[PDB]
Design a protein around this ligand. Structure first.
Ligand SMILES: NC1CCN(C(=O)c2ccc(=O)[nH]c2)CC1
Length: 103
């Protein structure tokens, strides 16, 4: 129970983060040229919210995997100095910090 409750705590805190804006909704490949081709497994906070709400995480590890996928995707598609990339670095470091401060 504590696994998914912390997952809920951190997910809520990421969803409400100032730097969360590139990750609140799935990237729309029709608006982002090359995204479909470059990013094999899209992931975003709302998709993680949907899976978490639907009970779809077996362990806290799977939730962390989806989160890390959000940020791996971000770093794969965006320059580190891009606005989305910079936000992704803030969000990634935030996630890793929060994750480690519990686990
Ligand atoms: N509604 C938001 C605004 C724009 N937005 C991006 O531009 C983006 C995010 C991640 C990425 O990898 N590439 C582009 C995220 C969705």
């Amino acid at each position: 129970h504590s696994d998914l409750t912390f997952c809920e705590i951190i997910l809520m805190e990421m969803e409400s983060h100032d730097a969360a804006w590139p990750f609140l909704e799935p990237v729309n490949p029709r608006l982002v040229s090359g995204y479909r081709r470059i990013i094999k497994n899209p992931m975003d906070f709302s998709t993680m919210r949907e899976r978490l709400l639907r009970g779809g995480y077996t362990s806290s590890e799977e939730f962390a995997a989806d989160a890390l996928l959000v940020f791996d995707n971000c770093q794969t598609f965006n320059e580190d100095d891009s606005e989305v990339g910079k936000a992704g670095h803030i969000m990634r470091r935030f996630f890793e910090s929060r994750w480690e401060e519990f686990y």
